[PDB]
């Protein structure tokens, strides 16, 4: 089975494994690294999306929108302080 | 083109399938994904160079993420990475 499905991961391990070469980050890359990277990428996006889903749901909207993302991002201090210099286009204060 | 929106849709359906997403929000997610990726990768590279290493491994990224990431998110993500690579390698 594919490397992602072997890991159970929902991201293109092959792309990122390629990208690790394509970005010159190192002339060698070890097989777990793109897998480990994909795992944390999935985890990170899940955490934000969960909060943003609550934000849309709380606003009675099915559509997740920048407002709902921004509201989520600023409500978690960790995400907010992690993302303190990220600016959300059409994300209101 | 080389974009994650399909993977965003996967995890979106996996996390809140009751929610749609604006293309704007989807693009923001793509920008977000690229930002965090280049942040962790650029760090791990410079750490590897500091360690005089021509290769990047799980330890480098596992260290880099613990450097970048807030303390809870770090150990949670670290555990997720170690679990995932354990499944991958045990397979």
């Amino acid at each position: 089975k594919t490397r992602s499905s072997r890991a159970g991961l929902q991201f293109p391990v092959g792309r990122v494994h390629r990208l690790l070469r394509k970005g010159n980050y190192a002339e060698r890359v070890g097989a777990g690294a793109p897998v480990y990277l994909a795992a944390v990428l999935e985890y990170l996006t899940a955490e934000i999306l969960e909060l943003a889903g609550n934000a849309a749901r709380d606003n009675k909207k099915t559509r997740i929108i920048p407002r709902h993302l921004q509201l989520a991002v600023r409500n978690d201090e960790e995400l907010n302080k992690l993302l303190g210099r990220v600016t959300i286009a059409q994300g209101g204060v | 083109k080389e974009s994650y929106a399909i993977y965003v849709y996967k995890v979106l359906k996996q996390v809140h399938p009751d929610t749609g997403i604006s293309s704007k929000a989807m693009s923001i997610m793509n920008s977000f994904v690229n930002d965090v990726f280049e942040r962790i990768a650029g760090e791990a590279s410079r750490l590897a160079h500091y360690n005089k290493r021509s290769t990047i491994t799980s330890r480098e990224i596992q260290t880099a993420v613990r450097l970048l990431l807030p303390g809870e998110l770090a150990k949670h993500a670290v555990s997720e990475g170690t679990k995932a690579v354990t499944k991958y390698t045990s397979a």
Binding site: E42, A46, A55, D58, H68, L71, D76 | L73
Partner: peptide, 14 residues
């Protein structure tokens, strides 16, 4: 199904 590991403050966004 993509469960979240962190235990965090509950929020009302409405």
């Amino acid at each position: 199904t993509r469960f979240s590991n962190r235990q965090n403050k509950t929020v009302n966004y409405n």
